């Protein structure tokens, strides 16, 4: 079983929190299904342009290419789409990237990409959304959002804990809750599908930790746990109440008045951080109306998934909104959208967002000066409204630049 | 135990399926607790200028007043929430109409809200969101927004089947799904909290059963059943199987093509009502973008929420939603926003959502004289800009009516 590791680099090492970073490290890359076949080629141009351009020839990547998806059954056979020398090698590498996948109805095989979150224990889902100027967006004021979305990835109903409707084992369950756990509440127990919904001390706490340390470091003005938890009282009720119980714990939280909120004292600054809560159903709104209030964000799994795709939609750039799984061990940054399977070698979809994840990569490395130069070509090409077809067709006369020659345009902003 | 029933009325009967409505007859309110008290006095003269209008005396309302919430202890002493009489009159007056309810947090009581519509097996809860020409909106094209939701209302997470985070109960349950179930898959297990989410064949199947219905009446041009389905394969992924399966089988559905799409043939109008799925967090997208695309739309109870409150706010009016619980034997038309308990007595908040709420009522009872009346009289009061505080505050210059004067607008709008 191989993947060609690069003679040409070394690896990257994790010694103790601090991230050891080569001149020319090692970093995988997985291609993707349908675009990602475009796409990625855009990645390692503009990325391999910014590495050039900043540190002027003496760092570089060598870029090893892994598999998962359609391309796993290719290179590996087809029965085979999430070989194991992927899950060794993004551990081992300590960084990789990604396009996107797919995962096949039929075969009884949860989502690849849930399959990697999982399996690496990558429990921070890190999404940023915020508005570069000139993206041609819905709302009003697309200008007044700039959140960091920080989603429980380990938990929640999403875990895969669910059986069938008539199963023996649902129907083994029903018994148990009924016969058992008391349970006169299951409207129609007669074929009905059962899923389960799990939250941790520990889960929550760490998401929770990690967020609010997110704000201190980049001086962010709040942390806004979510949760649709008047209803789910033990599950994200609860979430709520563990990340207030650590803001005030392993933070130093003060009340602001009659609570709940808090104040977390930024050491580094002085400002403060103020801790706050906000129902689900009501933040949905919240967003679209004061959307400048909310800036840091704590979620759990499935809340966090549908705050970042209404958030990237309202800022327009639902196809360049960046992704980061994050870990204790590796990280792995990917592209948040599909591919479009009538698009695919077409060389057509904006490739923004593999684009800005490896500028979230980069920027975790520790290259902030390759990072932010990726970031101002962006704007220089979106901003010179010579953009992509899906830009393109709700702009005044935007140039209509391909796949690849949007890439160019990022190279040519820099 | 004692509400006076009216000496003036006569009850509403069911004779099977038809809805005899007297020209006098008795339909209970439920106050509200905060701006309740506010808002429902709009409503009942509203209403009953409707009435006077459009029928010239003929017809008229003999309106009880039930008791739930605040108001329930206050009258039946502070330890009574929801008495039964009040469950018996909404059952046996078969509909009825209420104002904003709280539930208290401290001595583990469930939402009210739900318990009513729980109890009383109101399992549709219709929540329809379209633009009200004039309403300041936050995106650019809110009128492209005419939206019927039909959320379930009887199941998923939020029937309240949860052990709290170390509770000897939720420990029991996870002996059971690691130990018995050969569930290797609760990330920490230690201090976890758990809730549980059903889907039987019956509640999917009578909720779209509904939708399509709603359609068909009303010639409406598709029905979209969303749902995060390819994650929650046997609970929301069954949402839509059996959506489909009835929409076949019921109703006719004849394949667009390679699927997995439907036809269902308008018996009345000949044109052909879409049924067809989208994933819920790309549905969220999917409504700031392309929102003419969506009409008839089906839910399960969480999404239900979520959907109603986003498609609120494009559409500006989260003040002005209306909502309906609707089931077999009765139905409860209501209030979908707070009451905000600073504002309560104040006479300041909009009372538009009660009032549409009554709209829905009035059509439901088979009278859609007064209906149209006061839709149009919402209109005109919003048109000439002659608003509330919370619409007022958005538009250049719009005079500030309190809410009774709000009431007062629609009335000399009729
Ligand atoms: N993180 C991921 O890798 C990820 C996440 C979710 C889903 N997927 C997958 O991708 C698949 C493809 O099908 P779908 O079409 O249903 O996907 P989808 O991702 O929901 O599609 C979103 C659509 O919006 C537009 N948009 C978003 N990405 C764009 C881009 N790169 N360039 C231009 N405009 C963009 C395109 O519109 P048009 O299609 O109209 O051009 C695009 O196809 C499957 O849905 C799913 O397995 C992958
Ligand atoms: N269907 C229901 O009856 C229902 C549903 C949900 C919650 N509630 C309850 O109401 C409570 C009150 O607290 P909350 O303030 O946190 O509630 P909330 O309903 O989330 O508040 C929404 C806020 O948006 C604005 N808005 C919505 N309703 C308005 C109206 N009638 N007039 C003018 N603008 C309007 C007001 O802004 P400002 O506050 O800034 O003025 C309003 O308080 C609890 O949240 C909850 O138990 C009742
Ligand atoms: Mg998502
Ligand atoms: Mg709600």
Redesign the interface.
Known sequence: SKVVVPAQGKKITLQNGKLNVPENPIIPYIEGDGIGVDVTPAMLKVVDAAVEKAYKGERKISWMEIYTGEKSTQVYGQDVWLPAETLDLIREYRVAIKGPLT?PVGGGI??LN?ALRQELDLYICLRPVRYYQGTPS????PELTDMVIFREN??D?????????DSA??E??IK??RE??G?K???????????????????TKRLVRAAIEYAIANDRDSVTLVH?G???????G?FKDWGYQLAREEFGGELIDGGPWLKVKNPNTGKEIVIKDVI???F??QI??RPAEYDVIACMN?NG??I???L???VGG?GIAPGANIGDECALFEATHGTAPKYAGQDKVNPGSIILSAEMMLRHMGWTEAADLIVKGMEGAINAKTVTYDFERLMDGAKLLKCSEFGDAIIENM
């Open positions: 995962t949860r989502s849930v819905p709302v009003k004021h380990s938990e109903i999403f875990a895969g804990i669910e059986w069938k409707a084992d649902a083994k369950v148990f809750l058992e756990m349970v509440k299951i409207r129609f127990p007669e074929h009905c599908g059962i899923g389960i919904k799990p939250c941790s001390e520990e889960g649709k008047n209803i789910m009282k033990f599950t994200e609860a689900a159903d009501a949905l709104q679209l109306l499935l998934d549908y970042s795709d209404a990237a939609a309202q639902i």
